[PDB]
Design a protein around this ligand. Sequence first.
Ligand SMILES: Nc1ncnc2c1ncn2[C@@H]1O[C@H](COP(=O)(O)OP(=O)(O)O)[C@@H](O)[C@H]1O
Ligand SMILES: Nc1ncnc2c1ncn2[C@@H]1O[C@H](COP(=O)(O)OP(=O)(O)O)[C@@H](O)[C@H]1O
Ligand SMILES: Nc1ncnc2c1ncn2[C@@H]1O[C@H](COP(=O)(O)OP(=O)(O)O)[C@@H](O)[C@H]1O
Ligand code: BEF
Ligand code: BEF
Ligand code: BEF
Ligand SMILES: [Mg+2]
Ligand SMILES: [Mg+2]
Ligand SMILES: [Mg+2]
Lengths: 370, 370, 168, 316, 400, 151
Amino acid sequence: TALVCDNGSGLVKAGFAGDDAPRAVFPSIVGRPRHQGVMVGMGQKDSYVGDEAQSKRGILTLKYPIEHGIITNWDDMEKIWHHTFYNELRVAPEEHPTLLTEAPLNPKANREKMTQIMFETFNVPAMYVAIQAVLSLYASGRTTGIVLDSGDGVTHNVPIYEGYALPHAIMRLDLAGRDLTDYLMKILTERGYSFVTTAEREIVRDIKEKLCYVALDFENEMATAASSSSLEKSYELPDGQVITIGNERFRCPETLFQPSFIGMESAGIHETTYNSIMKCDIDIRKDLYANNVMSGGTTMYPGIADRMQKEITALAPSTMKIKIIAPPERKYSVWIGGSILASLSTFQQMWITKQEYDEAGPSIVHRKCF
Amino acid sequence: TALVCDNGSGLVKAGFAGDDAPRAVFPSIVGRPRHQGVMVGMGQKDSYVGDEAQSKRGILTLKYPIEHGIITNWDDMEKIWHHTFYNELRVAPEEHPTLLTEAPLNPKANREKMTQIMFETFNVPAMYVAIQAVLSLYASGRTTGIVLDSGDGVTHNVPIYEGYALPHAIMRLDLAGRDLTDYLMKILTERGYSFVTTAEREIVRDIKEKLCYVALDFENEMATAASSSSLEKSYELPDGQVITIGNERFRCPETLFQPSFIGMESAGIHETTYNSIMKCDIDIRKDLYANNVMSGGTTMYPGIADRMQKEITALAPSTMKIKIIAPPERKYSVWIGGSILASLSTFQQMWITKQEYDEAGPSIVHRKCF
Amino acid sequence: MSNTLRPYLNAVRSTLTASLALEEFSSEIVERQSQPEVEVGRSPEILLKPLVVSRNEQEQCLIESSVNSVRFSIRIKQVDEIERILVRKFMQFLMGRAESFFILRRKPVQGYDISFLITNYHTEEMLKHKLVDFIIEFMEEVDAEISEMKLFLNGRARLVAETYLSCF
Amino acid sequence: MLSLDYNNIFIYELLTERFSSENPSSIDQVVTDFDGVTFHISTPEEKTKILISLSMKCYPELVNYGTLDLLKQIYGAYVHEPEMGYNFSILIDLQQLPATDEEKEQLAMSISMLKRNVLAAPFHRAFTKQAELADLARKDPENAPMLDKQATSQELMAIHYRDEETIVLWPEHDRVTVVFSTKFREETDRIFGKVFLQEFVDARRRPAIQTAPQVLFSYDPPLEIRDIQGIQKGDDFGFVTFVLFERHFTPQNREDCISHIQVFRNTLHFHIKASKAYMHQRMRKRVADFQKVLNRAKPDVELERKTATGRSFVRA
Amino acid sequence: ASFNVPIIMDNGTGYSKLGYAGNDAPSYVFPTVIATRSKRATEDLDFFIGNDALKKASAGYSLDYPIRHGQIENWDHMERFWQQSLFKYLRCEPEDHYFLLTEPPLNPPENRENTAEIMFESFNCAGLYIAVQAVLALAASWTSSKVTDRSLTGTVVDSGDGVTHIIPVAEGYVIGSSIKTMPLAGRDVTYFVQSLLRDRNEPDSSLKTAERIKEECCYVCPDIVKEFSRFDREPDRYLKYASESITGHSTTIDVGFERFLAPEIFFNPEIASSDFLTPLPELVDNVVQSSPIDVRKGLYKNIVLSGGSTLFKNFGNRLQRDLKRIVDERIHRSEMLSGAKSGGVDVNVISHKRQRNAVWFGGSLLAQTPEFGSYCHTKADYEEYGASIARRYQIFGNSL
Amino acid sequence: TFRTLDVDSITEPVLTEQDIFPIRNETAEQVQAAVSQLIPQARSAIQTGNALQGLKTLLSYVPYGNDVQEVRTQYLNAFVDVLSNIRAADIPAFVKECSTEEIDNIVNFIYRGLANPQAYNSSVLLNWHEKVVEISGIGCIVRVLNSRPDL
Ligand SMILES: Nc1ncnc2c1ncn2[C@@H]1O[C@H](COP(=O)(O)OP(=O)(O)O)[C@@H](O)[C@H]1O
Ligand SMILES: Nc1ncnc2c1ncn2[C@@H]1O[C@H](COP(=O)(O)OP(=O)(O)O)[C@@H](O)[C@H]1O
Ligand SMILES: Nc1ncnc2c1ncn2[C@@H]1O[C@H](COP(=O)(O)OP(=O)(O)O)[C@@H](O)[C@H]1O
Ligand code: BEF
Ligand code: BEF
Ligand code: BEF
Ligand SMILES: [Mg+2]
Ligand SMILES: [Mg+2]
Ligand SMILES: [Mg+2]
């Protein structure tokens, strides 16, 4: 067995290769206390990690060590990996290879320090660093398609044909569920309700995860919510009081299809997918159009597969069929795909091994993992 | 049963003597992946050949190993013979004597090396290297006639009377269906369709096959198409985009009659046929005009028989019959003629046999073949 | 490949599937030991008659059989000295891996190119219809594998010829 | 490596050490080379003085073709009495050594270049005599064929430079022709050697490499070498001929061309060995795909979950 | 037989030493490393080896070491390493020369078979001898090749970069029932020096810097709990080492208790492995006591050291004193039961001038002997029996 | 040394093939006469074109024994010659009408013809092998594996 540790920017998703689904899913958060620690003894800790922080958050400054899929704070990222292996999986990491992941078009130094900490702190016996939108394509049961992965921090497209990636046609967009959370705070502020702190940012994430949905036709949905009760509904806070919301429920997800709302100049996710298909060689485009693959938690909004199929069918030539593949387990497909990969018998030849790291130094990942 | 291959400069035609048509017809292509394989488990393969390369082409750089009827990349030609023997016909080359086919006025080195490979790499029991135009008279059932063969790589006339060829009156022209694809790619740019890659070349080869024709008078057809949409057609690319095509529908095949379009200084196929007949002895011309035989895929354009009869009737003396026999099987008529020749009772003494080759070396071929 | 070997490989497939009727058998000459009786040959009543199947003087199979073991040995096409070297070496890689192709011998029987030993334990713990499909799919493809290697040898003979000759 | 070095690497590295060294140690080093050649490097009188010496079975022939004047031109003051058991010897003093690091570099190169400087003498005799015939032929183009005919039999060099070879060369007013009467005695190299020599001739007949010498091949000898000693037609030799035209040994090219033609048979000998190293890596690729054809005979069972060292594990 | 100087190749896990028999040093000593890539196919021509393949890590080649724990274990890489050794560096013709190759005592028969088929079928060499490497290293001890200077009885302790093994030899015969082997040597102590620099988080801990800190700074102390205590009392023992990075800039490394705790891997191999628990002085006593009784005075009297990883400052004296302690304690138990005295046994551990490459100098000195062409596998025997001619162990007792 | 001296061959006499298969009752000259009368009937059946009645009569008796190679080879020469002279479309009409005893005599001798390709054309024997096994089933090879070794 080998660990598969998809340290995403919003959730760590971890477990064992060939296991059905990730067994350690928790916030990619380190919390530190912000108040007068008056009661002596009491089992107090200098910092808290994951669900241990999320449940204590009313006294903590929660901060994610990872932003837009790039590690910003290594002293806390080691704290998350240590929590993953010793507290959440309860293994010794020196006994198991780890398949890690990262998004494409990351800094070189991210990939180096992430191999160095696995070999020099966690003492791991072998490791590998897969591209997240390649893994999501194993989890679809395919060898050609265009994975749209979108998580908490990054959205990216990787077009693949016959198992060859077309790396010139990879699109990264630094917009995903954390920007939709920050935008939901900016529009909730307009109805009556103020959310400000790093802990209140989790309450509005827990709104976004169950009140929001994607409108199939935003400009007509906007007129319908401005003229009826049916689109409005309510959520009950930790403080027992009720929050009622309406056109905020679909204006939030719409930022993915209209990044101009949060001040970005870019294509939306629909036109970013088409700009990746139209960068590919002309003979493969039909087999990409019939195999768009949704992945990552930001693709979980009710109606996003219907909307994505509508917007791509308007951009694509009407002569040919579009399919969006969106399984119900697309919430974890990058982990699911790493759990396939780390169990394929040729894969056991591809690991960076401890001995090979010791001899080659941390630059070995650049001449073995892609 | 003997084999017969017409190793065409763009399609391989291969089969067994006494069959009515080729057993296997496939592009004379070898392709290598241009991109990086990211999937494991996939059957990654270092080269594809024939129809598999034509099918996977969106990720391949495609090479033709024969240029103007001359083999120019021997390694990718040995791959194609190994594909004809072990994959397409799926018979071992040692079991059957084998008729190969070649254009007139080729390098001596081309026919020697093609003999040395067949006896010392494919170990064949016997072989013969017939001239492609001499086989077109067998297919047409003639013993007197002037052939006009035109393939992917080359166009040539061989005038023949009562089975005696006139090798001083052979005209050979390195202009045929490849240079018409290269020119159609160029003039397609003037309507705005940029085709550039070795795989987009195979889309523009298909446009040329599906839509082009030879117009009975070019200045009249130009003045027609300049006024009207009635001569236009539309073709759906494998992308689902539709191109629409104008006077370049017939300005492409006119290159055969006006080589100055592609900058080269030579007589078009009409004048080069008339010059071949005017080089011949005066008593035989009167029969060469009556038995003018076409062959090879570049002679398949709609209206090319009527264009060719109109032009030869304008050149040749009006007092006698011009009669062009372009049969409906002419696409394969070199192979069909080879399958007749290799089947004759009187030909079975004419093979170069292995025991007769290795006492003389590959220079035996020039003293048994034409 | 197939169509020229089709008469031969249907004779080999049919002989080899009729030959692979193996059983557990404790040896009669030694106590508390089983041994592959085709390979030891010390008790004759549990050997079956050795059958040859054959297309040509070059291309042959010898099939030897016993109550708990079958030995199968083949000569493949070697029509020039380049195929003699390429075959003789290719089979030494293929038998050098015998610990992971469980049915291979590490040495051929004398005068054969490669040899297989399908013991009772293999027909209990492996799919015996996929064992004969591997023997047959090896005999179809090995002529295409070796002929391709003599193309790559010509390809390098050109690589070094052009690279030497083009720097005068 | 794709093509052989012309110099002996060991003597280059060794002299590059001692020419840099602040404190030389003593040495006694016999050092083999191709074509049966052998060097001896030693410090016989002092650690300060290096004697380099050369042994080569055909050196008595090379002295007939003017070798000593070429070696005295190149090595000058460093030439020494031949060491007992060796054909030629040079004594270089590490305290009397040249001044600059680029003088040291080109002297360490020049001394390591000894095998191709001793075997160059018949080539310089042919190139410099072709320069005389090129002027005489330019004085009378109708006499020129007869000057070529007599130089083809009177000015011919033959060197029995190893026992399974002969290099034969002669000047004519527009060329130097050189013929290798070449044989591979090791039978697995003779079998590949047919492919390597055949594809070498067939390579010259392609548009890409027309700029090269005209190579030709046979197995009987070229008409002008049919009565040279040791050339025999029946003994399974092959006769690779290069025709070097005036453009293949123009003054900028001569030294590379001499260096590069001597090494001919050694590149084929090296590439025959280095082709077995290729065929093996291509064989063990097809073995690894026949593994898949057997793997479909193993029934599907999950082998139990284990730690990296193979010890058993208890999770999932 | 050919008369040409036999070629000698000690392919170590760390360094290959190459040369010709009868020379006074190896022609080359360079790392056993190959640099490889990670319309004709040439990725098997583009490789480099030795000192010229360290220069290639920045040019995008992957370096790999085809010998690990004293055994060849990548045969594609080792075949390319030999062709390049023979045709670039040694610049020889294999068909003219006999070759002496070396391997550890406990190598698998499969590796001698693969070595023989590569030498006889790929290179076609005239003949081959595959010497057990520590059996040669005794012959580097002699003051000269001449018969009166020989001392053909002695234990030989060999420790390179990848294996240590102790071979007893007596009256010129290798006592094969008594060989001891432990795959812990110069590289495993480098990974330990590297592991310590890395736990202190020093600016550089690349393999080349731990390899240099071993041979610059480390030594074998008497006892590590007193040496840790000395590093508190005696603060000039914390050396400062200046290292230059892969990318060409300065650094400074403090070197600490790895100055003694790293060479201690030989005298307490529990520090390195769970599997090889027996320390080198007791591993030597297990050799000499397993050996037949009459040779034991001779085997202790002459314990030859060999191979680069025996060169640590004070290594010979630690081995001599800890072995003398084991030996005189055992003799004094025997004096106790008897009440009589004994003459004891002298234990000498012999460090000497050729200790850095002793196996090569041993191979060179043996291969000069007129008999050597008769001990080789000649290629005539290879053409008769095939590569199985090399499969039999010369050293151990064989059934059949 | 003693380890290599075999004793089993001289203290534990093993079975012989004539213990496992009953010995032939007909004497060598009695079968050599019985075959030499049949081969002319088979040679004649080829010369009159009725080659299929040649096989039916030739296959009515079979020679076997370690004493008779010089006539087992003549019987095999006549049998391979008769198999090479039957039209391939007549084979399915012959094989479906053979008894299981005659079939087990055909396939037994085609595996003797396939053992000597330098004297027999394998291509026609492999064609008979496909047709006899496809029509009569795989057990007809199993009866050859199990058959007498001096056939
Ligand atoms: N049902 C849902 N509806 C909308 N957003 C969701 C839903 N489920 C998860 N998300 C969002 O997905 C993000 C986490 O997705 P994930 O794929 O695990 O990201 P990452 O890999 O970067 O950690 C968070 O922003 C979370 O709120
Ligand atoms: N129906 C067609 N109409 C026009 N061009 C054709 C047609 N069929 C084939 N061609 C062209 O003819 C060429 C192939 O003809 P072929 O006789 O097989 O040439 P070759 O023998 O040299 O390979 C290609 O350029 C192909 O595009
Ligand atoms: N002075 C020294 N002190 C300690 N180790 C040394 C010294 N000099 C070299 N070494 C070590 O010796 C080893 C190489 O020894 P060698 O005999 O060549 O081993 P091998 O044969 O296995 O390659 C390396 O670990 C090297 O760092
Ligand atoms: F980091 Be998550 F994939 F956005
Ligand atoms: F062979 Be094609 F006719 F050039
Ligand atoms: F490989 Be070294 F000899 F330890
Ligand atoms: Mg993610
Ligand atoms: Mg053609
Ligand atoms: Mg060593």
